[PDB]
């Protein structure tokens, strides 16, 4: 019930966390180009 | 041990916990005789965050908006409401899943996992256990980072950026590769 | 606490990559197994740590030389066992021992004495495995 | 039960008539609008746009209006023991007309029209004509 | 130990607390369901009973395509496993005749439940519906696709709402185009269409598509919120009997510490 | 403390369980001496009532039907019976709310809040510092009245009545006068 | 096991409601994750608790006297900060105290001198605390 409750709770956010990282790299480079090497 | 009219002595004891158990005669009778604490935690190290330092149970005397600014004082509770806001989000979430969660909680909870990660940083010593360089990181850098984090300036940012890096402006760089690496 | 220093380079290279996985592995394990629907990246993942958990079983009395465990970790972390049945890799490693023991003497002795891997010894062990699955047949 | 017109006017989000007794009720057909009332025939009829209007047994002269974009209508017969005459007006968006406004309607015209300017599919067409028909015809009902 | 036995404590005293919460909170959203159902299901019925004026034989051969509307959380009680039971049941019976089976669902569960076994005859699935309140244009997206993908014959299994502690499983024989033009449609004498028939046949028949989905979603919603509510009281009793076990333990493990540790010292006292 | 054929000496003792483990040797070795047990509770003097005995948690050893009777042992276990279903019904009224209720719940209830209020009781003592005065209540009336309130012929009086009355005339007479 | 005999009057009138409602709050503090799905009834319970605790909070080393406590607990409990953001009241309170201290002195004394809260103090009180929101502007 310990370790059970606690692995599943990191899955879950680890996955959750993981789809959005995943998103926020897509739409970064976009809405802060002064970050792209692109533009340097 | 102790500060005099005539010199000074800055002592730095690392105390054996035995069993993980603070609750043991000597922590408990050493606890007493420090001015400041730092307790370093296993579950998490298991997340791989070196140095294993638990914020919620180290504390200092010297954390006073008299002594450091409220700059830092505020920053420093804030970071703390936060990681136990983050804490007692932890059940709801390993019952019922993220999905119950607020869009509130979720930032609350995007933010403390920065922040977790964010404290991390390689030492020069542990580079023959990582092989990654070592950091020395200036405290208004720290302050800095931290109110931007908590700002919500960053939360655009991936949470895996925040890994071993002694400044924003490096979290900001391993972003960049990152997504650079994605295509 | 020694670690990599108590480490040959040859299995520094395979085993940190390796370490990586399994943790990563251990910590969706417990989501994985009540069954939702995951990303590719995420099932990579749980594919690959079943792989090198069913890599790490070993018979008593049946050790192994460091070249050879090389050579099988090679085998499993490039990505040679994920397709592959996790039941089938128990022979899948016995049979690749023994040709890796039959035709390629060679690739272990330099693995022994230099302990490391050049590029040379990396494109010998990919063609060694490309033709070891060539020659055999699997469930996947 | 009695005489009447039993009417249920319908849509997704709301029933704003279950089984109310009325005398009269104004539809507005793919063909043209009609006035069902009891005796009418069983039917069914398609509904392109326009403004129901509802006059209550107990009313007389006094309505109710409702905006429909389209849905259909369906017309029943009494039962010999209940005495009563039935109809169903389903609607996917049943709006009443004091919660219209003739600005937006206009603004969305103008944007239609844009997005239809450039004719290539016929779809993208046949909606900016339709859009047309049911602006103009929320235009000449709102208030 | 002492430990074990008090994490055990404070785990379990957490989940019925967060049960209670939740069974409060499904209790407000079976209310809002319910609310839905009175308001959109006049807007389904009678469409529904005009075509099913129209007999629908389910013994006919031809390609079967399954709707099996589910959820996409879990604490739902048992409604998804009978959901999936009842699809089995209907795909093994229809294949043995010969139909080819298609297979379109609703909800990651009935996915996670039929993926191993009936995997191989998945068409299309869709999920995160029940995210937002169920509306008619979530519905209607459904039904173009299930006609696009025009079948000979089409069943779909969901769960009907009796009362807030009991439900039941159904499959509705849909029509469609197929078995339509396969009748003259003499039922349908009796009403008068204002446009003919014909012309108006195809909008009928995508109105009762949509409004068929609709309604059975609605029903299977309130279904599922009531199981949740079932489940999370049972959980939340189940909590508390374990909470009085694990009690009786910890004070027996501190009862035997105490004596440990005195007779230890006394032992050590006794030895001098 | 026992009797004997001169008199009797009767104990009231009040007991600390450590740690809220019954299990301990100290009141494990003290509950097998006990022949009763009164709990208190403030649960129940939040709503007012005094004495603040719950009679649920309350146990005896007398309460059996061969020293009381066997219709002492009836009303009693009826009144209990009562009181567990009138709990019941408000953990429900705590979520589905005091409209679902069929009729027979609501006169349970009724009946429920009735007996609660009513066994509530003043004290001659507590006059000094209140001025209403003290009510002495033989056993049989209590019993009549716990059977009158019981099988339903009361459930017209109101729930206010039943309230700090020493017996159930006097609850008709507030009843009678509260009307006015 | 003293309580409100160790009280002056002017506290007891506030903190036998406060205690009260402090304890309803603590019947509803796991719905505050759920509060979005609930009703009325509820959230108020939840809304005052809330602003209560945030105005139970202090500063290391500044405490405050029984009139001044009397008067933001009047402030406090006669829901005149339910529609505030509660990171706000922190500030609320002190500008109040300041508010106060520059203007009705002759209430502070009143408290401390009868150690009552009458009706014509309390509706001073109510006086002071309109024209204190009236001249300043809060978040919510």
């Known amino acids: 019930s310990v370790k059970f409750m606690d692995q599943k709770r990191s899955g879950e956010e680890t996955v959750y966390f993981k789809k959005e990282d995943e998103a926020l790299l897509r739409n970064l480079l976009a809405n802060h180009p002064e970050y792209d090497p692109k533009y340097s | 041990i102790t500060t005099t009219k005539k010199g000074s002595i800055t002592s730095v004891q690392a105390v054996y916990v035995p069993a993980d158990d603070l609750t043991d005669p000597a922590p408990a009778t050493t606890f007493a005789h420090l001015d400041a604490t730092t307790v370093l935690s296993r579950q998490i190290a298991e997340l791989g965050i070196y140095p294993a330092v638990d914020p919620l149970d180290s504390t200092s005397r010297m954390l006073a908006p008299e002594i450091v600014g409220q700059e830092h004082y505020d920053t420093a509770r804030a970071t703390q409401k936060l990681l136990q806001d983050y804490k007692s989000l932890q059940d709801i979430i390993a019952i019922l899943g993220m999905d119950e969660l607020s869009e509130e909680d979720k930032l609350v909870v995007s933010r403390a996992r920065k922040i977790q990660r964010f404290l991390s940083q390689p030492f020069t010593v542990a580079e023959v256990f990582t092989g990654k360089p070592g950091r020395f990181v200036e405290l208004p850098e720290t302050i800095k980072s931290a109110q931007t984090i908590l700002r919500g300036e960053c939360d655009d940012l991936p949470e895996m950026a925040f890994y071993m890096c002694g400044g924003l402006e490096e979290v900001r760089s391993k972003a960049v590769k990152m997504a650079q690496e994605a295509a | 606490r020694v670690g990599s220093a108590a480490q040959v380079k040859a299995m520094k290279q395979v085993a940190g990559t390796m370490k990586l996985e399994l943790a990563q592995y251990r910590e969706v394990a417990a989501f994985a197994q009540f069954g939702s629907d995951l990303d590719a990246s995420t099932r990579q993942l749980l594919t690959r740590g079943t792989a090198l958990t069913e890599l790490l079983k070993q018979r008593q009395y049946s050790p192994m030389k460091n070249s050879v465990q090389v050579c099988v970790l090679y085998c499993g972390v490039k990505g040679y066992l994920d397709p592959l049945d996790p039941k089938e890799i128990s022979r899948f490693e016995s049979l690749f021992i023994d040709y890796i023991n039959a035709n390629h003497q060679d690739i272990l002795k330099t693995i022994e004495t230099e302990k490391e891997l050049s590029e040379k010894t990396e494109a010998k062990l990919r063609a060694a495995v490309d033709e070891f699955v060539a020659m055999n047949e699997f469930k996947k | ?143 | 130990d002492l430990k074990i036995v008090a994490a055990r404590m404070k785990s379990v005293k957490s989940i019925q607390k967060i049960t209670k919460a939740m069974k409060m909170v499904a209790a407000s959203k079976l209310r809002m369901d319910q609310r839905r159902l009175e308001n959109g299901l006049p807007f389904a019925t009678p469409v529904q009973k005009l075509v099913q004026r129209i007999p629908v034989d389910p013994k006919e051969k031809g390609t079967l395509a399954v709707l099996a509307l589910s959820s996409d959380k879990g604490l739902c009680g048992g409604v998804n496993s009978f959901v999936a039971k009842q699809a089995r049941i209907v795909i093994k019976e229809n294949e043995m005749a010969g139909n080819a089976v298609q297979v379109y669902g609703v909800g990651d569960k009935i996915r996670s439940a039929l993926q191993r076994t009936f995997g191989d005859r998945f068409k299309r699935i869709m999920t995160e519906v029940t995210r937002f309140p169920w509306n008619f244009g979530q519905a209607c997206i459904i039904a173009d696709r299930l006609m696009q993908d025009n079948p000979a014959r089409l069943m779909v299994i969901y769960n009907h709402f009796k009362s807030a502690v009991a439900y039941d499983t159904l499959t509705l024989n849909v029509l469609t185009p197929t078995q339509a033009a396969q009748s003259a449609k003499e039922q349908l004498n009796t009403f008068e269409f204002e446009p003919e028939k014909t012309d108006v046949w195809k909008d009928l028949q995508d109105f009762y598509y949509a409004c068929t989905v609709f309604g059975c979603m609605l029903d299977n919603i309130a279904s599922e919120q009531s199981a949740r509510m079932s489940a999370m009281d049972n959980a939340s009793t189940n909590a508390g009997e374990m909470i009085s076990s694990l009690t009786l333990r910890y004070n027996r493990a501190r009862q035997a510490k105490i004596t440990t540790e005195l007779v230890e010292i006394i032992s050590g006292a006794n030895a001098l």
Not at chain 4, 24 to 39: C, D, I, L, R
Not at chain 4, 59 to 68: K, M, N
Request: aromatic share 4%.
């Open chain 4, 1 to 143: 039960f009695k005489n009447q017109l039993l009417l249920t006017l319908s849509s997704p989000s709301e029933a704003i008539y279950v089984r109310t007794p009325v005398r009269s009720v104004t539809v507005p057909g793919s063909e043209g609008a009609m006035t069902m009332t009891n005796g009418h025939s069983q039917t069914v009829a398609r509904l392109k746009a326009g403004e129901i209007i509802v006059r209550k047994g107990e009313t007389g002269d006094e309505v109710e209006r409702f905006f429909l974009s389209d849905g259909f209508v369906l017309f029943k017969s009494p039962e010999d023991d209940s005495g009563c005459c039935t109809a169903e007006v389903l609607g996917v968006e049943v709006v009443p007309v004091s919660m219209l406004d003739k600005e937006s309607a206009a603004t969305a015209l103008q944007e239609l029209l844009q997005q239809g300017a450039g004719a290539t599919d016929e779809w993208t067409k046949a909606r900016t004509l339709l859009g047309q028909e049911l602006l103009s015809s929320v235009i000449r009902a709102a208030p």
